[PDB]
């Protein structure tokens, strides 16, 4: 009744499960008919947002990391962190999402406090 849930990506449905057995508590996604599996390491993930009250669209969004240290200037003497790789997960379950986001989200704030 937690961690494991259903989610969809790129029009491909699958099951989303979190793993708190390994060092970097990560989660992997596996499709049922799409014959695909996406392992998203919460470690590499720094951001996590679910859709509550205001957002009844039931969807979980997790972003990787950001390192501006490797940025690059420009003709306008301006720079910025290299556009990372964000991920927006969306399922047709508002109850599930809020159940898996609450467990996967906390880990971010918990990890970020040490990582």
């Amino acid at each position: 009744p937690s961690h494991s849930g259903a989610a969809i990506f790129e029009k491909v449905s699958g099951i989303i499960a979190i793993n708190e057995d390994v060092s970097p508590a990560e989660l992997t996604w596996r499709s049922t008919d799409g014959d695909k599996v996406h392992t998203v390491v919460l470690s590499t993930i720094d951001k996590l947002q679910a859709t509550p009250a205001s957002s009844e669209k039931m969807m979980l969004r997790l972003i990787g990391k950001v390192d501006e240290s490797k940025k690059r200037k420009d003709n306008e003497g301006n720079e910025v962190v290299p556009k990372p790789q964000r991920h927006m997960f969306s399922f047709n379950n508002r109850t599930v999402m809020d159940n898996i986001k609450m467990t996967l989200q906390q880990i971010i704030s918990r990890y970020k406090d040490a990582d």
């Binding site: 996590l48 679910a50 969807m59 927006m88």
Partner: peptide, 27 residues
């Protein structure tokens, strides 16, 4: 596009609920 979703109604409301824990440094 027009009669689609997951990118106009069912995918545009999670940009205002999180982003406030211990990321991007701070304390």
């Amino acid at each position: 596009p027009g009669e689609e979703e997951d990118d106009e109604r069912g995918a545009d409301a999670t940009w205002d609920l999180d982003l406030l824990l211990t990321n991007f440094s701070g304390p």
